[PDB]
Design a binder for these strands. Structure first.
Lengths: 175, 142, 206, 58, 37
RNA sequence: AUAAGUGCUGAAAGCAUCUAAGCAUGAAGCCCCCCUCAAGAUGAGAUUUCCCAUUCCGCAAGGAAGUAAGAUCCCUGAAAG
RNA sequence: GGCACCUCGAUGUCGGCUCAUCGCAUCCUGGGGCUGUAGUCGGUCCCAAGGGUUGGGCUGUUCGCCCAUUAAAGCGGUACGCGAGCUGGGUUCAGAACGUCGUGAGACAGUUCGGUCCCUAUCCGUCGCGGGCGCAGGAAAUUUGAGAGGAGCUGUCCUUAG
């Protein structure tokens, strides 16, 4: 019941580095990432070990200790394996397709809708009625996923547009 | 009887960095220096003040949530339309106006008040237009 | 952007090679000359100062004579400057002529408007006037000043005064025809300013 | 007079109120505001009083 | 959204939450979410 | 750049969480882009060019008296009044 | 409405015309939550004061009802905005009349016909236009832009698409 206390790992040559002022930078097999933190939390680089300690004990310090631990763990896992979010649209004629690095969607809108990934995020069209986004970092991947969902969030009558994986959707009778 | 000095003023030129000192205290003290209250031979109608130069006004800082809360109102006397801008603005494009208005409020109001205000100079960056006055850096007290 | 400096000669109409009929304003612009290439590094901004019409030596004072000496041309009666143009595109002292424009281009035109002298409120701001009958002694007066509580009259109430003589802009005019041999421009529609006044022509910003 | 005395004191590491307190405890300084300003414009004397006041203040 | 100065948990599934100085209730039932003031 | 709204990440408080640390998006609204005025902006700004730094007096504080460039008076007028 | 505090050595009262200008507790337009929101159309609530927010019949009337529209035909403050700006149709004078009350002179928030609306702008203020001086020489032009002002509203139809 204290996330900020537990420890992180360095599974396989996951180069964890500490910069000048509580700022970090990791170069895993998937890629490279960086992050900066306020100086209160003391993160120490150790061989298969890295510390997470807060000087004092009170509201803001506790919250930020928990967050920095969770962020470090999430980022190291992401740069180790890379992470993806699944979007499985539904529609009678709704279409998902590739246009090179760019992505184009066909939905009940009279014109097509385009998307331009740029942050090292990569999307795939594994099937006509399913689109999966891959990327190193959870924040950016989820941001792109929500961006796609905003193109057409589903309706509660028939269900349409974009759907996150296993995303239950409210059902309303259509009479 | 006390000596009401006049035509015996020697105005020093002072420099201060406002990068790390809050504008409130900075203004409240620099107003006194600009008025010359710090001089031992102060008089109330002769403007014994001292020229000052502000530096790095853009790096001034505000306490609390003032950076979005403090409103810099202004009313042109044209019909009932106001013009307003927040505090964090003017860091962007013209921070000398913040300091000028603050000091303007600080100093006494009057003709001699404007005369005292005349000796203030505020700039962005960390370079004076002028070095011929042999200005000397003067950190604050409070 | 592009533009030239010219004089308004008159107004007429022209057929467009379709059956339709076009009203058109006729502008003459003898080849302008660039006098000074205002540049950012010294003048704070980029622009070109150019002059259009000539002056006799009797009227050309020595200052403007020496000023134009760099361009090496006759002293220019009217001078104006344009912003947003490419400095490198124009040598100082080169001519502009009128072929820079061409038929079909969209154009914005500006110039001083016709003077009209001390005019009343109705003629000036076009607000209705009191009844002409039923004993109304309020024929052509400018309305009440304002409420009582403010104990004054606000700024910006519309009252009689002078009219005309302020530069105005008309947006999205079309260049119907151009005649380089005469140094002539033909703008669709109508343009501010009296006859033989100065008109300036600029590529539309929109 | 108070303003001038305050300026003179502040230019010697001492606030006006502490200066007056220190003077009073250092002795009955029947010497007062106006002539203290005359000492200020003869500042060396004013410093020669301020040092005594500071020394006796602690 | 209901904007009522009195904010209550309408159904147990509702949960009260403190955001941007103003309390709200989040419930998967969208019919219940509300903000005070 | 924001309002309401929708959010991604994420603890406080192993969960959850649009939040406290971060990152977004988002109105005929706000600040510009459009048009006009604007250096009396006494903070009187800048650029291009012309005149040159004479004669008199206390020699000098500084005065006066002809001029340089350029204007004015006066006169013919209006596209202005 | 209660009170009588300023004004009875006089502060002009309803409605309309002219001119506006402000608040937002929003009538339309813009952006959203929920809906017993299938869709066109709606109801409720949140942000939103930029702009717009109609012509006639009746009545002195505002207010109302009605006709025809528009996206809508907002609610209020400004001495129930505005008479040294106008109007005088009504209340609020003197004439006369009907009903009623009064023995009577006469009286009616009962009615009806008629019934003098003064002023050369001194100072602020507002809209325009001049002269003087300053801008540590004197001139002729071109300009930067602090900072002000204006606009900043919308329908219909074809297509997408039956």
């Amino acid at each position: 019941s204290r996330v900020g206390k537990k420890l992180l790992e360095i599974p396989s040559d996951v180069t964890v580095t500490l910069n000048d002022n509580n700022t970090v930078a990791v170069k895993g097999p998937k890629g490279e990432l960086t992050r900066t933190f306020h100086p209160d939390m003391e993160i120490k680089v150790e061989d298969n070990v890295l510390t997470v300690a807060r000087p004092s004990d009170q509201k803001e310090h506790r919250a930020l200790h928990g967050t920095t631990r969770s962020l470090l763990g999430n980022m190291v896992e992401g740069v180790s394996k890379g992470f993806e979010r699944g979007l499985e649209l539904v529609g009678v004629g709704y279409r998902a397709s590739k246009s090179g690095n760019k992505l184009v969607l066909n939905v009940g809108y009279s014109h097509p809708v385009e998307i331009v990934p740029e942050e090292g995020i990569e999307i795939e069209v594994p099937s006509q009625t399913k689109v999966v986004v891959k990327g190193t970092d959870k924040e950016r991947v989820g941001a792109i996923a929500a961006n796609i969902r905003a193109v057409r969030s589903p309706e509660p009558y028939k269900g349409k547009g974009i759907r996150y994986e296993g995303e239950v959707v409210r059902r309303k009778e259509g009479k | 009887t006390p000596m009401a000095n006049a035509s015996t003023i020697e105005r020093k030129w002072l420099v201060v960095d406002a990068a790390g000192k809050t504008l409130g205290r900075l203004s409240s003290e620099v107003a006194a220096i600009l008025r010359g209250k710090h001089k031992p031979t102060y008089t109330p109608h002769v403007d014994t003040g001292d020229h000052v130069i502000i530096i790095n006004a853009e790096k001034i800082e505000l306490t609390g949530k003032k950076l979005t809360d403090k409103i810099y109102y202004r009313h042109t006397q044209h019909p009932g339309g106001l013009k307003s801008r927040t505090a964090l603005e003017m860091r962007t494009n013209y921070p000398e106006k913040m300091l000028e208005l603050a000091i303007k409020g600080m100093l006494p109001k009057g003709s001699l008040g404007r005369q005292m205000f005349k000796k203030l100079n505020v700039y962005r960056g960390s370079e004076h237009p002028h070095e011929a006055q042999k200005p000397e850096v003067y950190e604050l007290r409070g | 952007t592009k533009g030239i400096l010219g004089r308004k000669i008159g107004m007429t109409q022209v057929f467009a090679e379709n059956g339709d009929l076009i009203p058109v304003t006729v502008i003459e612009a003898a080849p302008n000359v660039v006098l000074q290439k205002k540049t950012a590094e010294n003048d704070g901004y980029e622009a070109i100062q150019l002059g259009f019409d000539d002056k006799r030596e009797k009227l050309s004072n020595k200052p403007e004579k020496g000023h134009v000496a760099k361009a090496e041309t006759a002293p220019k009666r009217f001078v104006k400057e344009l912003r947003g143009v490419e400095m490198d595109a124009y040598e100082v002292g080169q001519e502009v002529k009128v072929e820079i424009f061409s038929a079909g281009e969209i154009v914005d035109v500006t110039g001083v408007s016709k003077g009209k002298g001390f005019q009343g409120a109705i003629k000036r701001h076009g607000q209705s006037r009191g009844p002409m009958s039923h004993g109304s002694r309020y024929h052509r007066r400018p309305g009440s000043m304002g409420p009582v509580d403010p104990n004054r009259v606000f700024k910006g109430k519309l009252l009689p005064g002078r009219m005309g003589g302020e530069q105005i802009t008309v947006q999205n005019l079309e260049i119907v025809k151009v005649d380089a041999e005469r140094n002539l421009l033909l703008i669709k529609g109508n343009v501010p300013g009296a006859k033989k006044s100065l008109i300036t022509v600029k590529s539309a910003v929109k | 007079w108070i303003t001038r005395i305050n300026a003179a004191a502040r230019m010697n590491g001492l606030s006006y109120s502490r200066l007056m307190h220190g003077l009073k405890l250092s002795g009955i300084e029947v010497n007062r505001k106006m002539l203290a300003d005359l000492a200020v414009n003869d500042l060396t004397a004013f410093n020669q009083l301020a040092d005594a006041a500071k020394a006796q203040l602690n | 959204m209901k904007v009522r100065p009195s904010v209550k948990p309408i159904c147990e599934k509702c949960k009260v939450i403190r955001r941007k100085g103003k309390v709200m209730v989040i419930c998967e039932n969208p019919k219940h979410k509300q903000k005070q003031g």
